[PDB]
Amino acid sequence: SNVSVLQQFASGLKRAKAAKELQHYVTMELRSTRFYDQLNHHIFELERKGGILAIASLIGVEGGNATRIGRFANYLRNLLPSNDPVVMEMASKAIGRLAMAGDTFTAEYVEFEVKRALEWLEGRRHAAVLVLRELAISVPTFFFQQVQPFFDNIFVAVWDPKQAIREGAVAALRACLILTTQRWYRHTFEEAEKGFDDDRIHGALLILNELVRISSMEGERLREEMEEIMGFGTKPRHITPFTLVESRCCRDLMEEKFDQVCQWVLKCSLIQMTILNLLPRLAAFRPTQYLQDTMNHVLSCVKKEKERTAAFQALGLLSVAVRSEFKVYLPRVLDIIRAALPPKVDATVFTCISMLARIQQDIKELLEPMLAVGLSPALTAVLYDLSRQI
Question: Where are the HEAT repeats?
Answer without folding.
Answer: 1-31, 32-64, 65-102, 103-139, 140-180, 182-216, 217-239, 253-287, 288-323, 324-358, 359-390
